[PDB]
């Protein structure tokens, strides 16, 4: 077609121009914000070229731009980082002191997300075909809002999106129909998303040529829902009757078009739930699935054989590589095995810095910073640390991410998604680190000063046996007076004492859309350590062999949008 022409040769022009595309964004950059009060901070006397830019311009992380994203939550609405007003903040699922971190973000952005988004078709109708034909279910959903005292949204990149007028009324494609109506999707209450998201893709099964969502997480919480609830889902379909459960009114209406008395429909999903094996289930629900767009790179690798067991062995598309901070580019070859799957920078996002990653653990001098590597000149088989500056005020700002080339497309590089810095422990968007966890454990280590007991050694693993998935932490103790050891009843609240200690985004994966399993604490016999910590990354069948119990965090830890 003429529309996915003229979005590759856009991809074969930004490809092709690489560093010059990237020398302009920049100059951009620098012509719009050079009057900031962040840029002339570093006298950089009106110059928009990138060798002065390098010179000058701090390599930062987030904690070193705090005082200035503060005062903009405060209220402060100077030009500070960005010549455009700071529209909101986008919460990265990343945190620092253990809260979401705050990405400013501006208006004209959202262009630039949907600009992206709108490759991701043109690409990957060259490697699947006939997608057009019928439509994708995906389970897409909102979260949680807060504001800044000085008034400023802050809420997920995601959810800033979905409720956009760039994704509500987003541009007609008929190689991108989803089942899901809107309302379902920007329905706050995440029960009634989820239940309407899947009544509607079993009423349109037929239809279903891919299955999805942006991690593979969030698609193993929706086969794992209707395990759950696949008696009310199949009742509604047989009586053509929508659950009293889904109280929101734009909700019930949503689904009006479907809701249609189906016993036939409903006999062949209670047919195929009712069977204790559900391996290869996707394909008989949803026959013509060709492949489950998700993301299995990264942390999300651990998803790979459930996700394999329910589709019978069908295809993982990684689309894109994205964050809060900037939509970073997208997966040329969506075909590709899981294990070999390169992302491509798009130069026209923002102008992109790479810091070698063997340099990358050694503080950086703020008054001579270092040159860095420009995209156009990364090299096959080496790994970086992403720097980025963005349109909204991030100037040479570190991700977190470490890159390692895989080879070029045109003039522009290919990268293999190493990891997320620092990153222990993660089942969903949780990201959970050595130091959190250590203080973790720390916090309900005291909790056991009631007897005589002190934790003699600790290690994790994300167990995702179960979904939701969760954090699996192992314990040897150490008991002065055998008769007056710690029971069941006490380790349980050390569990939730652990996570009402981990991050913002761990307690609302708990709390708000059951997407992480509670916490489980197993205690090994005395001695089982010395055959490291404090994670696994077999090996934890030989811990398991020596696990004398194991507890349960028995509520849900504290956790509301507010802010500290
Ligand atoms: N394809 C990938 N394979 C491994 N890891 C990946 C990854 N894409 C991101 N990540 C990690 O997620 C980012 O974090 P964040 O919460 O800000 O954004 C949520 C993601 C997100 C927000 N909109 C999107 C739109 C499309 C795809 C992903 C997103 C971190 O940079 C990065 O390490």
Redesign the pocket.
Same mark, same amino acid.
């Given at each position: 077609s003429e529309k996915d022409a003229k979005a590759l040769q856009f991809i074969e022009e930004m490809t092709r121009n690489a560093d010059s595309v990237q020398e302009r964004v920049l100059a951009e950059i620098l012509s719009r914000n050079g009057e900031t009060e962040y840029l002339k901070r570093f006298k950089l006397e009106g110059s928009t070229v990138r060798e002065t830019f390098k010179s000058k311009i701090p390599v930062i992380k987030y904690e070193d731009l705090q005082p200035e994203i503060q005062r903009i939550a405060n209220g402060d609405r100077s030009a500070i980082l960005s010549a455009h007003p700071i529209s909101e903040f986008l919460t +990265? +699922?990343?945190t620092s002191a253990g809260e979401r971190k705050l990405m400013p973000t501006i208006q004209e952005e959202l262009d630039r997300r949907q600009m992206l988004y709108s490759l991701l078709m043109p690409v990957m109708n060259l490697y699947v075909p006939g997608l057009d034909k019928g439509k994708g279910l995906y389970f897409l959903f909102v979260k949680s809002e807060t504001r800044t005292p000085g008034g400023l949204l802050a809420r997920? $990149?995601?959810t800033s999106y979905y409720k956009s007028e760039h994704f509500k009324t987003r541009p007609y494609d008929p190689y991108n129909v989803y089942t899901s109506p809107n309302e379902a999707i920007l329905c706050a209450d995440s029960f009634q998303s989820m239940y309407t998201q899947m009544l509607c893709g079993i009423y349109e099964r037929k239809q279903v040529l891919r299955l999805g969502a $942006?991690f593979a997480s969030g698609l193993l919480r929706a086969i794992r829902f209707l395990q759950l609830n696949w008696h009310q889902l199949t009742h509604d379909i047989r009586t053509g009757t929508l659950s009293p459960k889904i109280t929101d009114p734009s909700v019930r209406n949503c689904v009006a078009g479907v809701l249609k008395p189906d016993p036939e429909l409903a006999d062949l999903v209670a047919g195929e739930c009712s069977k204790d094996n559900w391996e290869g289930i996707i394909t008989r629900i949803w026959p013509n699935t060709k492949y489950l767009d998700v993301?299995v790179?990264?942390? *999300?690798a651990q998803y790979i054989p459930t996700l394999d067991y329910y589709s019978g062995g069908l295809p993982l598309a990684?689309t *894109?590589?994205? +964050?809060?901070?900037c939509?970073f580019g997208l997966n040329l070859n969506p075909m590709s095995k899981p294990s070999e799957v390169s992302?491509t920078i798009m130069p026209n996002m923002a102008y992109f810095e790479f810091l070698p990653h063997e340099h990358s653990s050694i503080p950086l001098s703020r008054d001579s910073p270092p040159r860095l590597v420009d995209l156009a000149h990364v090299e096959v088989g080496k790994e970086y640390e992403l720097v980025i500056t963005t349109y909204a005020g991030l100037y040479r700002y570190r $991700?977190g991410?470490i890159l390692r080339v895989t080879g070029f497309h045109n003039s522009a590089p290919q990268f293999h998604?190493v990891r997320?810095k620092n990153v222990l422990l993660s089942i969903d +968007?949780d990201k959970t680190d050595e130091a959190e966890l250590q203080k973790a454990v720390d916090n309900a280590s005291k909790l056991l000063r009631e007897v005589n007991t002190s934790v003699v050694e600790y290690t994790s693993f994300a167990d995702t046996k179960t979904i939701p998935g969760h954090y699996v932490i192992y314990w040897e103790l150490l008991v002065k007076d055998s008769a007056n050891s710690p029971s069941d009843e006490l380790l349980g609240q050390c569990c939730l004492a652990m996570e009402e200690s981990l991050n913002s985004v761990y307690r609302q994966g708990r709390v708000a859309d059951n997407s992480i399993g509670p916490l489980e604490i197993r205690v090994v016999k005395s001695g089982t350590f010395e055959e490291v910590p404090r994670c696994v990354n077999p090996i934890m069948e030989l811990l398991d062999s020596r696990v004398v119990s194991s507890h349960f965090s028995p509520a849900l830890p504290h956790w509301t949008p507010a802010r500290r």
């Open positions: +990265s +699922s990343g997920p $990149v995601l $942006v993301i790179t990264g942390a *999300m990684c *894109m590589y994205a +964050s809060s901070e939509y992302y $991700v991410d998604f997320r +968007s």
